Amino acid sequence: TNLCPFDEVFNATRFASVYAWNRKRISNCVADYSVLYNSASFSTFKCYGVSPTKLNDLCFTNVYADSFVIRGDEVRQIAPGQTGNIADYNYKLPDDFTGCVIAWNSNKLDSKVSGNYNYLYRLFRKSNLKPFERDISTEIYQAGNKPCNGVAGFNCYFPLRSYSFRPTYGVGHQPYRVVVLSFELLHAPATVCGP
Amino acid sequence: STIEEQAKTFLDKFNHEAEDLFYQSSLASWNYNTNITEENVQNMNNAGDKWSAFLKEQSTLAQMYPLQEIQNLTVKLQLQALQQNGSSVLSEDKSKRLNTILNTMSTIYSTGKVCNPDNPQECLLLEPGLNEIMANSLDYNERLWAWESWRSEVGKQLRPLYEEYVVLKNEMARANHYEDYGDYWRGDYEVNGVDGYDYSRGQLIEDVEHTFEEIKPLYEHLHAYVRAKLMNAYPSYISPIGCLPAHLLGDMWGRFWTNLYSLTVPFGQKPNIDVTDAMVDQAWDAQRIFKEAEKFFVSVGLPNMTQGFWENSMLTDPGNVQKAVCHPTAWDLGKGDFRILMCTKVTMDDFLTAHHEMGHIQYDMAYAAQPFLLRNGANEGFHEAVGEIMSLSAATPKHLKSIGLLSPDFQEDNETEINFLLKQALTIVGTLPFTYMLEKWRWMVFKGEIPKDQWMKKWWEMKREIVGVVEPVPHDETYCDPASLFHVSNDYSFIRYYTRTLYQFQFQEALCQAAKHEGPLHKCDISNSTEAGQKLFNMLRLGKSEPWTLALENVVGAKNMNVRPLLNYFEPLFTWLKDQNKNSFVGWSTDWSPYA
Ligand SMILES: *[C@@H]1O[C@H](CO)[C@@H](O[C@@H]2O[C@H](CO)[C@@H](O)[C@H](O)[C@H]2NC(C)=O)[C@H](O)[C@H]1NC(C)=O
Ligand SMILES: *[C@@H]1O[C@H](CO)[C@@H](O)[C@H](O)[C@H]1NC(C)=O
Ligand SMILES: *[C@@H]1O[C@H](CO)[C@@H](O)[C@H](O)[C@H]1NC(C)=O
Ligand SMILES: *[C@@H]1O[C@H](CO)[C@@H](O)[C@H](O)[C@H]1NC(C)=O
Ligand SMILES: *[C@@H]1O[C@H](CO)[C@@H](O)[C@H](O)[C@H]1NC(C)=O
Ligand SMILES: *[C@@H]1O[C@H](CO)[C@@H](O)[C@H](O)[C@H]1NC(C)=O
C-alpha cells in the first residue's frame, strides 16, 4: 500500500512560473481520491471526460501533475478550446483532454506589500504553442523589420513580464495556484488503479 | 508586418507597464490624504515623478506611428490621447514663464488679506471670513465692503499677470493647430470618423446658444420673484424694472442663489422634510448609511460592493491625533481596488452624498474591462451626471417611507412641493446664465474679439443683458473681476457644469419611462426596476470606447443635448410663478444703476 506523493504536489512550499510549469510523474502507487473530493477548500475542481466520484476506481498506466501559479481571471483559460495569453503562449491543452483541473487561492503566501516579482509569464511569441509544450527561451521578440541583436529597443521587446502581486488587489488580480492532473491509458499493465 | 499591428503590439506593452506605476501613485496619494505626516509627502512626490517621467517617455516614443496608415477606430482613439504633446512644444524659455505665472496666481489667490479701512487690526480673508459674511447678513454697507475689498486687491494684482497668461496659452494651442486656447478646450466634444455621429468643435457653441433661448422665460420669472422679495429685506435700493446688485445674491460672485431661501419662502409655517431626528433617535451609525446605499443599486440592477471596499476604505473620521483631509471622494486605484474617503456624520446631507459617491464607484466598475487609456466617462459631463441622478431618487418622500425614516402616516400637501422646487431651482436654474456668460467671455477673450482695454467693460455689459446683475460701484480698466473666481485664476474649464445639468434630466426621464412611473417627474423613484438598471448599465459599461453621441442615444434615444426634460421637471413651479406675477414686470431694463 504505497501512497502516491500528493502531499509533495498540493503542499509544496514554492511553486513555479507559468512559462516554466512543473511536471511530476505519478506511477506505481496507491492513489487516494478522498482528500480531494471531500476537501471543500478548493475554488475550482473540474474534470473532463471522467466523473469525479464512482470513476475513482479505474486503472491507468501513468499519471501527470502539472503545477503553476496564475491570476484569478486567467483560471478560466485552463480548459480545452480556449484562447488568450496563457492558453496560446504559456500552457495549452488538447481538444480531447481527459483529466482534472484544480485551482485554489494563495493570497496569504504569494503576495507581498512591496510586490512579488518572482512570478513571470510570456507576453510575446511568434506562434502559438502545441499541446503540452514548454518554451523557456529568452530571445528578443522582433516585431519590426530591423534586427534586435538581443537588445531591447524600438520594436524590440523582452518576452517575459512579471505579475507583481500585492495584498490589496482585487479577487481577479490575486494569485491562484493551479494543478492539472492527466491520466494515461496505454497498452500497459496500468499499475495505478487506486481503491 | 504593417504599422497597425505594430501599434497593437506597442499598446500591449504600454498597457501592461502603465497599470503598475498608476497603483503606486494612487496609493501614495491615499496614504497622504488619510494620514498627513511629513514623511508621507516624499513617497507621493516620488510616485508622481515616476509616473510623469514614464508618461512623457512613452508619449515621445509613440509619435513614430502615423495615424493616416491606421483604419481601426479603437487603436486610433488610444493613440490620439497618448500622442498629444501638450505644453512641451513651447521653448524652454517660454516654459519657465507659464508655470511660474500659474503658481504665482494660485499662491496670490490662496493668500488673501481683506482689512477694513482705517483699522489695520482685524482682517478676515476668504475662508471662513468673507464667505461667512456673505452668507448670512442683511446690511447693505457690510455686504458692500467685502465685494469691493476682494476686487480691489486681488483683481489689481491679477490683471498684469493674466494678460501674459492669455498670450502664451494661445500660442501653445497655435502650435498644436487648434486656432487658439478656447478651441483646445472645445476639442473635448469632438467626434470624427463615425457616420451619423460626428461632432465638430464649433458646433458646441451653436448648440449652447439655442438651448439658452428656451430657458429665458423661467429664469425671468424666477429673477422677478426674487427681485420682488428682495425689496422688503432691503426696504429700498432695488428698482422694480432693474438689475439686481451684485452684492445681494448669496455668495460673493453670485454663482449660486441658494442662500436666498430664508428670504424667499413660497409657503412659510410649513417646514420641509428632514429625517436627521429620526436617524439620531433610533441608533443610526455610520455604516447603515452605506449598507442601505448598497441595497439601492442591488435592488435596481447592479452588482454589490467588493470585500476590499469594506475593509480598506475610510468611512468614518479617525479622530485622535491622526489627521485626515475630509473631502468626499471616490478612488479607483486599479487592480480591482475601489475605496471611498469621506468622514460622515448622522444627517441627511451625508445620506444623500453617500449615494453620489457610491454611484461614482459603480460607474468605475463597469469599464474596468476596457484598455487603460479608454477608462473614463464619454465626455467631461457624463461622470457627474450619473452619480447625481442617484441622489434625485434617494430623497423623494416615497423612498424614505420605504426604508423607515419618514412617518408612515405622512401626507403630501401641494403647498410643500413648491417649497422643495424653489430650493432646487435656486441652485440649478439660477446658475446656468452665470456659467454661459463666463465661458462666453473667456471664448471671446481667447478668440480676439475683445481688445485688451475693453475687458472690464464687456464683463459688466454681459452681466446686464444675460444674467441681470448690475455694478454696485463702477469699475475701470484696472481690475480683473473674473480672476476673482477659483476656476479663472487656476486654469480650469467651466462648460462642464452646463452640459451636465442638461444631461441629468435627460437620463432620469428615460429611466423613469422604463419604470412605468405615473405622475410628476420630480416624484419619480427608480427602485425595484430591472428595466432602467440594464439601460443605464448599457451606457456605463462602454467608457470611452464609443462616441458620446452613441452612448447618449443608447439611453435617451437622441443624438444631441436637449433642454425639454429640464423644463418638464420645473413645470408646476412655472405655473405658480406665472400666476403670482400678475402685478410686476418680467424682465430688466439695462439702464438703471445704483450709483447713477
Ligand atoms: C496539506 O497539508 C495539510 C496539513 O498537513 C493536510 O491536512 C489537511 O489540511 C486541511 C487544511 O489545510 C484540513 O482541512 C484537513 O482536515 C487536513 N487533513 C488531515 C488528514 O489532516 C492536507 O491533507 C495536505 N494536502 C493534501 C492534498 O494531502
Ligand atoms: C500614520 O503615519 C505615521 C507615520 O509617522 C505612522 O506612524 C502611523 O502608524 C500612521 N497611522 C495610521 C492609522 O496609518
Ligand atoms: C480594433 O482592435 C480591437 C483590439 O484588437 C479589436 O477587438 C477590434 O475588432 C478592432 N476593430 C475591428 C473593426 O476589427
Ligand atoms: C455580493 O453578492 C454575492 C452573490 O451575488 C455574494 O456571494 C457576496 O458575498 C456579496 N458581497 C457582499 C459584500 O455581501
Ligand atoms: C422596493 O421593494 C422593497 C422590498 O421590501 C420595498 O420595501 C420598497 O417599497 C419598494 N420600492 C417602491 C418604490 O415601492
Ligand atoms: C393646492 O391644491 C388645492 C386644491 O386643488 C388648490 O386650491 C391650491 O391652489 C393648490 N396650491 C397651489 C399653490 O397651487
Author numbering:
A (entry chain B): 333 to 527
B (entry chain A): 19 to 614
Paper passage:
To test whether the three substitutions of Omicron (S371L, S373P, and S375F) are critical for its stable one-RBD-up conformation, we generated Omicron-S-L371S/P373S/F375S mutant protein with the three residues (L371, P373, and F375) replaced by those (S371, S373, and S375) in the prototypic spike. The purified mutant protein was incubated with hACE2 in the same way to determine the cryo-EM structure. Strikingly, the structure revealed that the mutant spike predominantly exists in the three-RBD-up conformation after ACE2 binding, indicating that these three reverse mutations prime to transform into open conformation when bound to the ACE2 receptor. Local refinement for the RBD-hACE2 region of the complex was performed, and a clear density map was obtained. In addition, the three-RBD-up conformation of hACE2-bound mutant Omicron spike with reverse mutations (L371S, P373S and F375S) reveals the three emerging substitutions of Omicron (S371L, S373P, and S375F) play a crucial role in stabling the one-RBD-up conformation of the spike to fight against the conformational alteration triggered by ACE2 binding.
